[PDB]
Every structure is written in C-alpha cells, then in structure tokens.
CSV table of C-alpha atoms and ligand atoms in Angstrom, one decimal:
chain,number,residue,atom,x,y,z
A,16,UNK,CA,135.6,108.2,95.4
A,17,UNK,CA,135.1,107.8,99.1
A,18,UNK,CA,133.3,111.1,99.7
A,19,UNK,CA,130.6,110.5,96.5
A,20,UNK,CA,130.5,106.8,97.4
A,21,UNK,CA,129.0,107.3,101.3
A,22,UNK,CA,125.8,105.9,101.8
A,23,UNK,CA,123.0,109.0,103.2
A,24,UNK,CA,121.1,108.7,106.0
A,25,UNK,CA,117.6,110.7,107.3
A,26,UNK,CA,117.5,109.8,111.4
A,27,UNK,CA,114.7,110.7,113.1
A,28,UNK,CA,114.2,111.2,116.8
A,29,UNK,CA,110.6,111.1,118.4
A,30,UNK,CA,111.5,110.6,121.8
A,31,UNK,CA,110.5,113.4,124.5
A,32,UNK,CA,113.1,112.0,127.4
A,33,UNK,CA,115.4,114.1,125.7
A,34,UNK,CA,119.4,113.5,126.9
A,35,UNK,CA,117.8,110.8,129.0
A,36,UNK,CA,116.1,109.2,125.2
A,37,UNK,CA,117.0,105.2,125.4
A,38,UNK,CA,116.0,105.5,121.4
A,39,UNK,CA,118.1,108.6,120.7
A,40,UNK,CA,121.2,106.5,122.5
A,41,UNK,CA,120.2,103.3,120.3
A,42,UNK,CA,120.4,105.6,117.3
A,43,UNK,CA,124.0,107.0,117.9
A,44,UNK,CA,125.2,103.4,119.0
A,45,UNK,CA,123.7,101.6,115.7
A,46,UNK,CA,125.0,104.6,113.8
A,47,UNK,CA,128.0,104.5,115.4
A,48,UNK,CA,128.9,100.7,115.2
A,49,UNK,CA,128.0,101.2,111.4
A,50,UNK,CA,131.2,103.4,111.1
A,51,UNK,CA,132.9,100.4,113.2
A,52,UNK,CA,131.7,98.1,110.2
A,53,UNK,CA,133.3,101.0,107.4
A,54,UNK,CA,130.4,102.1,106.4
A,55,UNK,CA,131.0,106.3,105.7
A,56,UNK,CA,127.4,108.2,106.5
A,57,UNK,CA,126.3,111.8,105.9
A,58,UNK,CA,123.6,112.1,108.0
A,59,UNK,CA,120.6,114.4,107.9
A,60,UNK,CA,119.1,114.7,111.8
A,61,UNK,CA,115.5,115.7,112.7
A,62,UNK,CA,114.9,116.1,116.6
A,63,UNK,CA,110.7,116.1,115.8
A,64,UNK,CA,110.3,116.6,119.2
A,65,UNK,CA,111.6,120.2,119.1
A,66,UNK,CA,110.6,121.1,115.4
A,67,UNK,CA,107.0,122.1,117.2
A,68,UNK,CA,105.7,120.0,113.9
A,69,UNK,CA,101.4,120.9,113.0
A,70,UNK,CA,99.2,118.5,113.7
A,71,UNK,CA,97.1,117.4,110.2
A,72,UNK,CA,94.1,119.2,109.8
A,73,UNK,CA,91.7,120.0,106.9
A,74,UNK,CA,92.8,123.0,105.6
A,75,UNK,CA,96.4,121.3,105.6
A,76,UNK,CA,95.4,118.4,104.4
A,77,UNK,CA,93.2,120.5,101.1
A,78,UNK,CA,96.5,121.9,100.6
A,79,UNK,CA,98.5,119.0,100.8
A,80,UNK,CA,96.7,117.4,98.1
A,81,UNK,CA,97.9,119.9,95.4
A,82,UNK,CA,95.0,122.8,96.3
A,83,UNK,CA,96.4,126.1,96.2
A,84,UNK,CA,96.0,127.3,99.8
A,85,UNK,CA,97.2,130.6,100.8
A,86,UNK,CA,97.2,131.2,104.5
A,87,UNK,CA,101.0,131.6,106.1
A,88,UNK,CA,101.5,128.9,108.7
A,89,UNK,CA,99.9,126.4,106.1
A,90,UNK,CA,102.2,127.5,102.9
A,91,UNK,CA,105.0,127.2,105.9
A,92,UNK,CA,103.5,123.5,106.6
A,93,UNK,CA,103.8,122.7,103.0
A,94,UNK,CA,107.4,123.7,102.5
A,95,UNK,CA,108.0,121.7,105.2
A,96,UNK,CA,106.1,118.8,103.7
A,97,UNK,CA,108.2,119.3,100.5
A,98,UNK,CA,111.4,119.7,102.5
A,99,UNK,CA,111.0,116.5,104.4
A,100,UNK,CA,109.6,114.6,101.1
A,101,UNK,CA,113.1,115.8,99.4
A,102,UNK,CA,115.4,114.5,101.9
A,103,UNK,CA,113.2,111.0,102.2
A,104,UNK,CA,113.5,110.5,98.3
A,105,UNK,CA,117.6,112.0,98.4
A,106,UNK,CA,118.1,109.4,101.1
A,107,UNK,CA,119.3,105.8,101.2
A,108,UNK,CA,118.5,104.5,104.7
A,109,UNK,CA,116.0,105.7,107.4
A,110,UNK,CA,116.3,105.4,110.9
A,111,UNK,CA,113.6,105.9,112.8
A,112,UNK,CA,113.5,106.1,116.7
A,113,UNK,CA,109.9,105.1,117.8
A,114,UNK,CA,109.4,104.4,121.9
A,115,UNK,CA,106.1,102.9,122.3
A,116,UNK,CA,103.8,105.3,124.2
A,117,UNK,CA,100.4,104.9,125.3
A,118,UNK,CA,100.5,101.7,123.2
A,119,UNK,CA,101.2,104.2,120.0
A,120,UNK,CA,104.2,105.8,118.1
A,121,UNK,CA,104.9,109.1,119.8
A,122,UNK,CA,102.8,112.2,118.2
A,123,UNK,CA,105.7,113.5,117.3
A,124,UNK,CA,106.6,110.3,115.1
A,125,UNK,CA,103.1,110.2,113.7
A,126,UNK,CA,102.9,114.2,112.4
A,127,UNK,CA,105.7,113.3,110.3
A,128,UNK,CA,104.1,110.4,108.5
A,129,UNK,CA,101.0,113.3,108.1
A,130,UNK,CA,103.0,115.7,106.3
A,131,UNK,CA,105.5,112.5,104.5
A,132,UNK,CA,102.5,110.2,103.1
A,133,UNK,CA,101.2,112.6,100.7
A,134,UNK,CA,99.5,111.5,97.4
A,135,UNK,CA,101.3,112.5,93.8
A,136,UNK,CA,104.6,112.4,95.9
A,137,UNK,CA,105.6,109.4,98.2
A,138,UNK,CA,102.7,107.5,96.2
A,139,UNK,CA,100.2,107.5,93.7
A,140,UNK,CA,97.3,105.6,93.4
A,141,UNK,CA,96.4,102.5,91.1
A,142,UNK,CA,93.6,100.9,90.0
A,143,UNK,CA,94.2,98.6,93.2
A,144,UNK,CA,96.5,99.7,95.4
A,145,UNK,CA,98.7,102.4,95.4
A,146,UNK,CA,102.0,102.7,94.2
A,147,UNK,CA,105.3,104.3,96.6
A,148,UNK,CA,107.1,106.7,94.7
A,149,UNK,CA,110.1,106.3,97.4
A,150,UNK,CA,112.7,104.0,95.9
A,151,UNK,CA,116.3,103.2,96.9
A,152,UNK,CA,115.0,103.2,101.1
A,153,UNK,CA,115.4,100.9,103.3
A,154,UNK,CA,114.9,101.3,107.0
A,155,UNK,CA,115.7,100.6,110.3
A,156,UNK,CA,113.4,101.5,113.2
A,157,UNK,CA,114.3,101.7,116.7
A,158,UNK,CA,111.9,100.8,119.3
A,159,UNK,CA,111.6,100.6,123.1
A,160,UNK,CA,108.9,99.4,125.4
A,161,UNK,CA,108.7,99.1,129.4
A,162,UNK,CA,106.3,95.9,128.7
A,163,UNK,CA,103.8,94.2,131.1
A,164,UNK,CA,104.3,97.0,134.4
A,165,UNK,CA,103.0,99.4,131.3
A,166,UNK,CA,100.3,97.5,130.0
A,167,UNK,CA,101.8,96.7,126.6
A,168,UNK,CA,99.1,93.8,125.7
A,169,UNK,CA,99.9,94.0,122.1
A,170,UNK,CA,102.5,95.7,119.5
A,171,UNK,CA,100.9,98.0,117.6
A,172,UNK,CA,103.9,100.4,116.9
A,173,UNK,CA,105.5,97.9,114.4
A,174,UNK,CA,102.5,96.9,112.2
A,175,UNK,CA,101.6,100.5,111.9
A,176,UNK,CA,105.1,101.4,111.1
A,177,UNK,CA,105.6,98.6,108.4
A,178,UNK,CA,102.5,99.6,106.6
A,179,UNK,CA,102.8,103.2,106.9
A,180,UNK,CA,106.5,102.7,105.4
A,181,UNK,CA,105.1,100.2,102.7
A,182,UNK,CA,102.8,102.8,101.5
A,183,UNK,CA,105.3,105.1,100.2
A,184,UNK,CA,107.4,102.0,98.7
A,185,UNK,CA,109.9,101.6,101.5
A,186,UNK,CA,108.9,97.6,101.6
A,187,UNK,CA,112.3,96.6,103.2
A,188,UNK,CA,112.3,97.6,107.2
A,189,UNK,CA,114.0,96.2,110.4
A,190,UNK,CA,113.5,96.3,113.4
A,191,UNK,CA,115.7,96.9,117.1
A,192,UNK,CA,113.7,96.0,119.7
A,193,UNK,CA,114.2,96.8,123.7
A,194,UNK,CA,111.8,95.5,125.1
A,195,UNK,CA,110.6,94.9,128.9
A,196,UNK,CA,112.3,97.8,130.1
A,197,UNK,CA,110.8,97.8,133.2
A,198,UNK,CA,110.9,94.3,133.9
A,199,UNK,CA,112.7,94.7,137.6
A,200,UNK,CA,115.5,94.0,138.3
A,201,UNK,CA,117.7,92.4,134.8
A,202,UNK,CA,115.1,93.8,132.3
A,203,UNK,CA,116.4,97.2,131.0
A,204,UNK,CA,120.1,95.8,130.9
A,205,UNK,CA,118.8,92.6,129.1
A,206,UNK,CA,116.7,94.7,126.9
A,207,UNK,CA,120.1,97.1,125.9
A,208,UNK,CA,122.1,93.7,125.5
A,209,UNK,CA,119.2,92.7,123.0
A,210,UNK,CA,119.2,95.5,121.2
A,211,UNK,CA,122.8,95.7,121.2
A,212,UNK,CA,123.5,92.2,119.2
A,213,UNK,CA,120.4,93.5,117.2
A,214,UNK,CA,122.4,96.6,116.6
A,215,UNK,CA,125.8,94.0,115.6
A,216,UNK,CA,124.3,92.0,113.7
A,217,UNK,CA,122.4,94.8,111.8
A,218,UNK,CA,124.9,97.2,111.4
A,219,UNK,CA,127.0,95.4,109.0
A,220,UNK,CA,124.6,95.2,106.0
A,221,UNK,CA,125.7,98.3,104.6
B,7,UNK,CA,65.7,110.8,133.7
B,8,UNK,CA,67.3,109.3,136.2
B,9,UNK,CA,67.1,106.2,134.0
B,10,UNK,CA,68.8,107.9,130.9
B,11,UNK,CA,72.7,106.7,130.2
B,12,UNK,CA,75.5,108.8,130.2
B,13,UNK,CA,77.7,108.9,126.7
B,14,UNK,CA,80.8,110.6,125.7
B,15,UNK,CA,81.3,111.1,122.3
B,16,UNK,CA,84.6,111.7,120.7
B,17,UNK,CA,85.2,113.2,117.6
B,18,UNK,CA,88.5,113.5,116.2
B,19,UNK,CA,87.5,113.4,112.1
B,20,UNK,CA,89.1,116.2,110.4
B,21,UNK,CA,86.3,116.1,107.6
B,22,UNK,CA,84.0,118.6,109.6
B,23,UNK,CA,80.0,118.6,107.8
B,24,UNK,CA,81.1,115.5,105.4
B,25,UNK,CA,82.4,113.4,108.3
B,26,UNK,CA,80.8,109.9,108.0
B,27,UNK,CA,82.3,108.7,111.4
B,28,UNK,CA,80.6,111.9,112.6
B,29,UNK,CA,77.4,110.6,110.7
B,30,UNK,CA,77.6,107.0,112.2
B,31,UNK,CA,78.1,108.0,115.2
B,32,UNK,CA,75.0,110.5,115.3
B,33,UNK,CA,73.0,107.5,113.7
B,34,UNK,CA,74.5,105.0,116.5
B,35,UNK,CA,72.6,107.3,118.8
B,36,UNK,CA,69.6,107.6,116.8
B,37,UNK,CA,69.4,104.2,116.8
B,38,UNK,CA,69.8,104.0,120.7
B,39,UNK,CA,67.1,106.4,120.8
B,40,UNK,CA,64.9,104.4,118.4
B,41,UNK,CA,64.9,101.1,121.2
B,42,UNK,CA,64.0,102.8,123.9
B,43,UNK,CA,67.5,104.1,125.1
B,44,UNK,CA,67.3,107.8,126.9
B,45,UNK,CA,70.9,109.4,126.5
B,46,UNK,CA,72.7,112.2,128.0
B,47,UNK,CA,75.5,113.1,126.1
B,48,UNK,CA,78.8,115.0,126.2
B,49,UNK,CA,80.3,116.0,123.2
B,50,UNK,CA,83.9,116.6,122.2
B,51,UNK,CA,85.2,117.5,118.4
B,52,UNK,CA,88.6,116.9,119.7
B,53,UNK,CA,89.0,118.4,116.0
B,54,UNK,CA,88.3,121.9,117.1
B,55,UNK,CA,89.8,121.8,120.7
B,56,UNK,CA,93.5,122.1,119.5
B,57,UNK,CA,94.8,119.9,122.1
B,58,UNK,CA,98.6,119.9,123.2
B,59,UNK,CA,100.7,117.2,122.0
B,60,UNK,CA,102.8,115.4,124.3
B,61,UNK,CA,106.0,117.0,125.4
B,62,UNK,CA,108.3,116.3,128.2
B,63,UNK,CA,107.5,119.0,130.3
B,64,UNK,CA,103.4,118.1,130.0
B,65,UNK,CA,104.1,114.2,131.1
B,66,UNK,CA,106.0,114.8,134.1
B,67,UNK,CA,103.2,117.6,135.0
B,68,UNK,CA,100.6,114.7,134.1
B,69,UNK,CA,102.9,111.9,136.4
B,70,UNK,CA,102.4,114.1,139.8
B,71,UNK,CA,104.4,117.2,139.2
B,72,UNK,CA,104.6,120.5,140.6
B,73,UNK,CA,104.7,123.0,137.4
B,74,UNK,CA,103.5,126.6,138.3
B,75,UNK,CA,103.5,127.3,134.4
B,76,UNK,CA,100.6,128.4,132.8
B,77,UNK,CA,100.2,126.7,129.7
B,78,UNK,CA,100.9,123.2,131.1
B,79,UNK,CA,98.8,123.9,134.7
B,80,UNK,CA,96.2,124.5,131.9
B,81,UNK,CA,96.5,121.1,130.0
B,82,UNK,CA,96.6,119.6,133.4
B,83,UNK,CA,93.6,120.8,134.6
B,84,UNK,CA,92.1,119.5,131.1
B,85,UNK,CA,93.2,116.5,131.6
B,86,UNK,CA,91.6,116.4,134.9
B,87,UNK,CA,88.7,117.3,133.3
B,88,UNK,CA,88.4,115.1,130.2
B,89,UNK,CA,89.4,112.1,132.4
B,90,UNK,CA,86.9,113.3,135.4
B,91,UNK,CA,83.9,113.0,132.6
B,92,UNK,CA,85.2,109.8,131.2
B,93,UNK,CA,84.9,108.0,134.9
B,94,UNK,CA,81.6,109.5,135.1
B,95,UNK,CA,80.6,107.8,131.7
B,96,UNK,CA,78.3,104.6,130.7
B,97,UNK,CA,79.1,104.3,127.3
B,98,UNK,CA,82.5,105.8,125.8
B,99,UNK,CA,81.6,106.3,121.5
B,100,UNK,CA,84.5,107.0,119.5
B,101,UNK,CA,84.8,108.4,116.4
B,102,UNK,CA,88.3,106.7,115.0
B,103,UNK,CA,88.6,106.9,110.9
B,104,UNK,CA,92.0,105.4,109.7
B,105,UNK,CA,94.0,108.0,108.6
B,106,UNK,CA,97.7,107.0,107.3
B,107,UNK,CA,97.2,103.4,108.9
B,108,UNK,CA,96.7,105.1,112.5
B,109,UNK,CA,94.2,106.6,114.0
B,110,UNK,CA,93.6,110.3,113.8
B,111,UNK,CA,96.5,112.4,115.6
B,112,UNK,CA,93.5,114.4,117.5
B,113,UNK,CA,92.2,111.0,118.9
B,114,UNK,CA,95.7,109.7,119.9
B,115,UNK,CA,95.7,113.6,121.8
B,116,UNK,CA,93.1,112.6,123.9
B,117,UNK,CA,94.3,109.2,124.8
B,118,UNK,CA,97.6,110.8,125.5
B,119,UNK,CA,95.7,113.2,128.5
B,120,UNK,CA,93.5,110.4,129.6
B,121,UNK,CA,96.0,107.4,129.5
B,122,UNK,CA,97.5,108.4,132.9
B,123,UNK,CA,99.4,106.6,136.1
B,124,UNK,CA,97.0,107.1,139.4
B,125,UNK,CA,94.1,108.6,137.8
B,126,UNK,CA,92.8,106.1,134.6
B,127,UNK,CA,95.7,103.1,135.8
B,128,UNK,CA,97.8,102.1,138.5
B,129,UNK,CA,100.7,100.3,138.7
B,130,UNK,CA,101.7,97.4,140.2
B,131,UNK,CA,104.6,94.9,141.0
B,132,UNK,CA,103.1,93.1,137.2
B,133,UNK,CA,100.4,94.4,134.9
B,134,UNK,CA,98.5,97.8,135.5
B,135,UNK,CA,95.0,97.6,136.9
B,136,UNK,CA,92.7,99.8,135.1
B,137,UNK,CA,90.5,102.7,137.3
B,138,UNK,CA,87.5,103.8,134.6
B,139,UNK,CA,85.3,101.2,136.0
B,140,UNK,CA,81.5,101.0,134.7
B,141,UNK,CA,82.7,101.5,130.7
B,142,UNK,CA,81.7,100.0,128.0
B,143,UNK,CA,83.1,101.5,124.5
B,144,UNK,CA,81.9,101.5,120.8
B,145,UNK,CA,84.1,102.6,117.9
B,146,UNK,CA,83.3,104.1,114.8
B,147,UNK,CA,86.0,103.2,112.3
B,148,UNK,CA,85.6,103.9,108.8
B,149,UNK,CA,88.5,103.3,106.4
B,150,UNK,CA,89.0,103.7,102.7
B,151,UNK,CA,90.5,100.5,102.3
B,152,UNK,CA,92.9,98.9,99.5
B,153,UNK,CA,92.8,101.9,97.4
B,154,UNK,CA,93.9,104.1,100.0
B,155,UNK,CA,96.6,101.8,101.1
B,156,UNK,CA,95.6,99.5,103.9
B,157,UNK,CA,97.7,96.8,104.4
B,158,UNK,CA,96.8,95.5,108.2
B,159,UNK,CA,94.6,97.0,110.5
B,160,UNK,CA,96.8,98.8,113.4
B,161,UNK,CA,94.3,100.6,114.9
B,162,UNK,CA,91.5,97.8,116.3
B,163,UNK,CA,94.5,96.0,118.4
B,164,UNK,CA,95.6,99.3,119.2
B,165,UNK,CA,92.2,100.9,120.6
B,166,UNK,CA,91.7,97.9,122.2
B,167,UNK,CA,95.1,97.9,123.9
B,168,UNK,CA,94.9,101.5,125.0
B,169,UNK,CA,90.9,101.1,126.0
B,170,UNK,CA,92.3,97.8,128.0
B,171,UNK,CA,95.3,99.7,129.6
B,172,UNK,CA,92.2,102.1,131.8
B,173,UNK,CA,89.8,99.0,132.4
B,174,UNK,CA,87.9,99.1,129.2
B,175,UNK,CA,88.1,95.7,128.4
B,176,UNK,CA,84.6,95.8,126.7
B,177,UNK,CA,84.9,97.5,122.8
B,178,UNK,CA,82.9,97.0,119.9
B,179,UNK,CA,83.6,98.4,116.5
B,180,UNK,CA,81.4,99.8,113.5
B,181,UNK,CA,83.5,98.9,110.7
B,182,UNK,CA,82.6,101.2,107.4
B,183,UNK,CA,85.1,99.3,104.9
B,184,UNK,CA,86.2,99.5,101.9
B,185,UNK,CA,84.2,103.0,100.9
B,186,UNK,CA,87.0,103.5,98.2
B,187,UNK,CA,86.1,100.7,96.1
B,188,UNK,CA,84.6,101.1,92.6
B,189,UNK,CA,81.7,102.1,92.2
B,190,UNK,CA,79.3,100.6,95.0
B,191,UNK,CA,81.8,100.4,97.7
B,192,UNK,CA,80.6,103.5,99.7
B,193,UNK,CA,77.0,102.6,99.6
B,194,UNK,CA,78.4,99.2,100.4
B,195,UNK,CA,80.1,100.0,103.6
B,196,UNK,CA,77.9,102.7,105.1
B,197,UNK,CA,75.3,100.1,104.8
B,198,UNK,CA,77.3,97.2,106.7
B,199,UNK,CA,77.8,100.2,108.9
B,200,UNK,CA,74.1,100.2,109.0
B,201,UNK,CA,73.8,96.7,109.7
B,202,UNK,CA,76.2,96.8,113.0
B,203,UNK,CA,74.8,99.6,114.4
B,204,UNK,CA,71.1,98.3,114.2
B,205,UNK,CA,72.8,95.1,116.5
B,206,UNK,CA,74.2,97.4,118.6
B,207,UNK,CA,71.9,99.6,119.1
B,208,UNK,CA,69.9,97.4,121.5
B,209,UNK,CA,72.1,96.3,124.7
B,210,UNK,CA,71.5,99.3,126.6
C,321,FMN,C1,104.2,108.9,127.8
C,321,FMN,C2,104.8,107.5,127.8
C,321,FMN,C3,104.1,106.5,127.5
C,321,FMN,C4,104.6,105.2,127.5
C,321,FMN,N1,103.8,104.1,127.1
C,321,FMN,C5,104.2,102.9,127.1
C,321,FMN,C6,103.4,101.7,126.7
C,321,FMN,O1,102.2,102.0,126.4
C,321,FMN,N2,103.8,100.5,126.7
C,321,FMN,C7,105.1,100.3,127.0
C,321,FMN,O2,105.6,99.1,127.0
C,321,FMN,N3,105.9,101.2,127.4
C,321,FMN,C8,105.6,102.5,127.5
C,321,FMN,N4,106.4,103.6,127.9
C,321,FMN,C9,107.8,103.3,128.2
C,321,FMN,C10,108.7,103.5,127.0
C,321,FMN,O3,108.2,102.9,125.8
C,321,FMN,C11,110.2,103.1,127.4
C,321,FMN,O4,110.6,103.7,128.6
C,321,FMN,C12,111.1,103.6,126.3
C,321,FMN,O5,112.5,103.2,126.6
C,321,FMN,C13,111.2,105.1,126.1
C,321,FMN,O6,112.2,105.4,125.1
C,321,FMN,P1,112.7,106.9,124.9
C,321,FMN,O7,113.5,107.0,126.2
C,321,FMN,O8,113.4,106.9,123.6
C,321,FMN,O9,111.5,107.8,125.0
C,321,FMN,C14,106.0,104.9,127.9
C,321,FMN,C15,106.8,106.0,128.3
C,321,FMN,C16,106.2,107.3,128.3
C,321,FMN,C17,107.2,108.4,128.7
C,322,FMN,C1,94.5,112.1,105.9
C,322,FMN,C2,93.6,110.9,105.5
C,322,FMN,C3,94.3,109.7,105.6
C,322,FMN,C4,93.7,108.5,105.3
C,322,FMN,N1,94.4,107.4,105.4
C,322,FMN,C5,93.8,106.2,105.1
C,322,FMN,C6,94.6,105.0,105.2
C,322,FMN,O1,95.8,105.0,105.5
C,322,FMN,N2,94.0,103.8,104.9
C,322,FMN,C7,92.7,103.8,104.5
C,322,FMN,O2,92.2,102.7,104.2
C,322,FMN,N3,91.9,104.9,104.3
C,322,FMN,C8,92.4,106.1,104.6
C,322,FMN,N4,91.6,107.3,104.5
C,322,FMN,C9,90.2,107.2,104.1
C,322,FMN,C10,89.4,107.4,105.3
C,322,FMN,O3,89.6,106.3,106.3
C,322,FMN,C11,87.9,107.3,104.9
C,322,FMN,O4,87.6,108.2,103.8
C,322,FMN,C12,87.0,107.7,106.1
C,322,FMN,O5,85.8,107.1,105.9
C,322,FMN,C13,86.8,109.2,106.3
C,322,FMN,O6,86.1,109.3,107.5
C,322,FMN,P1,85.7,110.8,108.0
C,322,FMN,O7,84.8,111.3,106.9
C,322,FMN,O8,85.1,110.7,109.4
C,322,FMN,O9,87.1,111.5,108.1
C,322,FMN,C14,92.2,108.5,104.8
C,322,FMN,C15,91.6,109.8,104.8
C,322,FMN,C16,92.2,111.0,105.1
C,322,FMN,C17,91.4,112.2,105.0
C-alpha cells in the first residue's frame, strides 16, 4: 500500500553554480520538508547542466515531428526526446529549478522544453488551440533572482514558464520565489526566509 | 561612405532558405535602402555558428577569469568579438521568431556572450548602467500564434529587458502575427509585417 501509493516526482536542475546552486538547495529543502509533511516521493533527477543536452535545430526539429531522420547523434536526440516525454507523462509533480539569467531561464532549462514540447506527444493541435496530452501534472518551479544590482527590470522567466507548461496541459504551476538576492546587506537571507515559508506553506499540498 | 550606417544583423532562425524573419529582415534593409539609407552591414546566422551554451566554467572566464583552456579562451575571445562589433554598431536588427514561447535558443546564445559585467554593463551600488552607447535596435518577431500555442508574449518584455540591461533602451518590433491562422493569416501577417517596416524604414 505505502510503496504503490507514493506520489512520483521528475526534478530538474538548470543551475550552473553547481554545489554552490541556491535553486538545487531550494529543491532538496522543499523536497525534503515534503517528507516532513508524510508525503513518500520516488524521485527521478535530471542535473541538465551536465547531460551536455543539443540545442534544437532543423534537422532535429524534421525529426522530431515524426520524419524519419537517420543520422546518429539526432536518432540519439530523439530517444532522448522520448525518454524525457515518458518520465513527464509517468510523473505526478514537476519541480523545476529555474535561476533567472540574463533576464531568461537558463539554456540548459530551455533545451529541455525544445526536446519536451513536441507535437503528437505533450500536445496536439485543434482547430483553435492546441490541446496538452500531459495529464495528472502539476508543478512547482523554483526560481531565484539577484534583482535591481542585476538589472532585472521585468519577470520574464515565470510568464514563459507558465505558458510553456500550459502548452503541454500542465495548467496548475506554483511558484518559490527568492528574490533580490543581491540586495546588500538582509537581501539573500530575507530572500531564503521567503522562499522558505513559500516552501512551508507549499509543501503540504501533497 | 562615410555617411552610410553601421548594422548588425542577427539571425538565429532555424528555418534556413524558408526563414521569414530572415525574409523581413532582408526586406527591413531593402526598405532602408529604398529612403535613401546607405548600410554597412555585418551579418551573423547565429544558426550556423554553433555557439557554446553557458556553463560554469565559460561565465567565470567571461566575469574576469584566468582560464588557460582552449576551448573556453576561444569562446572568450568570441565574445570579445561579437561584443566589440555590437559597440561599434548604429542599428542592432534582430531576427527573434517565437519558438516554444521563448525566443530561439541560438539568439538567447548570443545574449548570453554579449550580456556581460565590465564590458556591455557595469555594476553599481543600485541598477546596472549600460556601456553599448549609440544603439538603437529593431526586432523581427514572427510568431504562429493561437494555433501554435501562444498564450502571452514572453519574449517582447524579455528582449526589451535584456536590450535595456546593455543601454539599449531604444527597440522597436516587426510583429508577423498570427501566420497560422486559417486560410489568410500568413498573407495577413507578412503584410502587417509589411506595413511596420515601411514606417520604419525611414528614421535613419
Ligand atoms: C549568468 C548569470 C546571469 C544572471 N542573470 C540575472 C538576471 O538577469 N537578473 C537577476 O535578477 N539575477 C541574475 N543572476 C543572479 C541569479 O538569478 C541568482 O544569483 C540565483 O540565485 C542563481 O541561482 P542558482 O545558484 O540556482 O544558479 C544571474 C546569475 C548568473 C550566474
Ligand atoms: C520549434 C518551433 C517552435 C515554435 N513555437 C511557437 C510558439 O510557441 N508559439 C507560436 O505562436 N509560434 C511558434 N512557432 C511558429 C513560428 O513562430 C513561426 O512559424 C515563425 O514565423 C517562423 O519563423 P522563421 O521562419 O524565421 O523560423 C514555432 C516554430 C518552430 C519551428
């Protein structure tokens, strides 16, 4: 009962600080303090940073959209596709980590929405809009920013996210936010404390 | 000749022959051509250049380092160079399709080189003062629309933030939308296009 009954998680890191990764830290303590609350998680981990992941191109891309493509490191590019598509669908909560940089998602982040976002698999299209083919997801996105000393005049990285996570049917999606990092000399503490209740408060749902 | 503009022109569509942000932009310069503007251009299908992503090694290299590697002394030295020809612009062009509600991975790989502490910004005790002075920008953004699933538009605010972060407060876009839509949408678009870039064409 216990072991079948565990709720399956896909967490991805984007960060390139590493051991150092504020996000990666986040993602542990809000994993962490959702064993606290009894929830029981088997978790599938993807490190994008070191997975060397190819950027999209247009041979990929051919291939991607159901063209029979033959050359090796694309085929390889596809399984991949299909591999991370799998464990997506399989899953029941995402958890993204997604440090703002150079007023962006990481690339790192971004490659895996190119290979993820594929039409006739996380979505089809309508006669309007299209439809995501990902059910039973919610998510949970962990993002980090220094603020004003690094000229973040505007939050793209959550709209993007939103809508690229809506696409593919994943509608519900919340959000831990650090922000003003740099803010000297209370900001990253006050930020982690923020992000912190965030995590409390959010960890609970189940 | 002396007179003549300098432009750089970024590419990043993935389309190749069939890009129509590649198209638009050509006919943005024809049009600049047409009233009276000479240009000198340099062009970059970031596309075809195979530019590194981001890793941690690369940004400390890029934030002052010494790395006697060769691969990132290489993408250093790029950067140098991509950032060196941007400072030297007049008008920045931009070539920035939507693609999965962001911008092309090959554009953001160029803003990730160029984007960079004591050569593009500089910090300070607040907000970072921007260093590419003399820079106006124009953006090519063609987007599918509704049928291929956008919900908001990430990548205006985004370019404009990014663009704003170096001291290119001034950006105007070319909007080609809704070129999914059934069965005049294309023509539709591509003519608004149209319609922009004969307004634009005639600042200097
Ligand atoms: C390459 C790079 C770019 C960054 N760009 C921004 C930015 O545009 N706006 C911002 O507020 N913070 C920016 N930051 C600061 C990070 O968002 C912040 O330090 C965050 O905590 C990093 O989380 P991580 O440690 O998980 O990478 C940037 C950091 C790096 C390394
Ligand atoms: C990989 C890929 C992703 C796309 N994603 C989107 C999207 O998220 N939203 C949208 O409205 N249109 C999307 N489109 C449609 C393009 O924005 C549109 O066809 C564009 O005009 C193509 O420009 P180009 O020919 O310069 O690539 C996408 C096209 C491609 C090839």
């Amino acid at each position: 009962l216990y072991f079948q009954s565990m709720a399956n998680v896909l967490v991805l890191k984007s960060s390139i600080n590493g051991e150092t990764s504020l996000t990666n830290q986040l993602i542990n303590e809000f994993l962490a303090a959702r064993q606290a609350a009894g929830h029981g998680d088997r978790l599938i981990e993807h490190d994008l940073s070191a997975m060397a992941l190819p950027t999209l191109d247009r041979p990929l891309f051919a291939a991607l959209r159901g063209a029979v493509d033959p050359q090796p490191a694309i085929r390889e590019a596809v399984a991949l596709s299909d591999q991370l598509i799998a464990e997506l669908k399989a899953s029941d909560l995402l958890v993204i980590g997604a440090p703002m940089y150079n007023l962006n998602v990481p690339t790192d982040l971004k490659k895996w929405f190119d290979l993820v976002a594929r039409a006739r698999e996380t979505f089809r299209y309508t006669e309007s809009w299209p439809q995501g083919l990902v059910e039973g997801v919610r998510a949970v996105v962990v993002s980090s920013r220094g603020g004003i000393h690094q000229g973040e005049t505007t939050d793209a990285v959550t709209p993007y996210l939103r809508a690229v996570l809506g696409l593919m049917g994943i509608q519900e999606v919340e959000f831990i936010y650090a922000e003003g990092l740099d803010n000297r000399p209370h900001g990253r503490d006050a930020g982690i404390a923020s992000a912190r209740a965030q995590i409390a408060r959010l960890a609970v749902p189940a």
